[PDB]
Amino acid sequence: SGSLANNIKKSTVIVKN
Amino acid sequence: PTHIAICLYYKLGETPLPLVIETGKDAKALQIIKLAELYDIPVIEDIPLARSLDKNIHKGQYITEDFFEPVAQLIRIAIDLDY
Numbered sequence: 649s650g651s652l653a654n655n656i657k658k659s660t661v662i663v664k665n
Numbered sequence: 666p667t668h669i670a671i672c673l674y675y676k677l678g679e680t681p682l683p684l685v686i687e688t689g690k691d692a693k694a695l696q697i698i699k700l701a702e703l704y705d706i707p708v709i710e711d712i713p714l715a716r717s718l719d720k721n722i723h724k725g726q727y728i729t730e731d732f733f734e735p736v737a738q739l740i741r742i743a744i745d746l747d748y
Contacts, residue, residue: 655687656672656700661743662708663671664698665715 668694670701670708671718673728675740682727683736688719707743711735 656662672687674680689697701708714735722728728736 652687652696653700655674656697656706657704659672659674659686659706660676660683661673661739662697662701662706663673663715663718663739664694664708664710665666665669665712 667691669715669719670694670697671715671722672697672706673736673739680727682733683740684727685718685722685724688724690719709739709742711739 668689668691670687670689670693671685673683674686675683687697689695698708700706714732718728718732722732
């Protein structure tokens, strides 16, 4: 558990619709 | 509005190209957006780009050639210059 959050924490930019 | 969120990561010496490290639809998209605010990750709304990334570039995959410049433009806006 926590992989989602750890990936978001380190990421550069999020693209959404 | 099927909601979609695509999480891009690019780090020199690690990442030879920008990487899609997480994706979400529907409730998972909403969660990703909430996590993005919690961690101060820039979020850009671009509906054609998001839809195209969602279809083409799966979690754990590098972006492909059609996306190189659109993603570069997002990176230039989103990069934290660290000062």
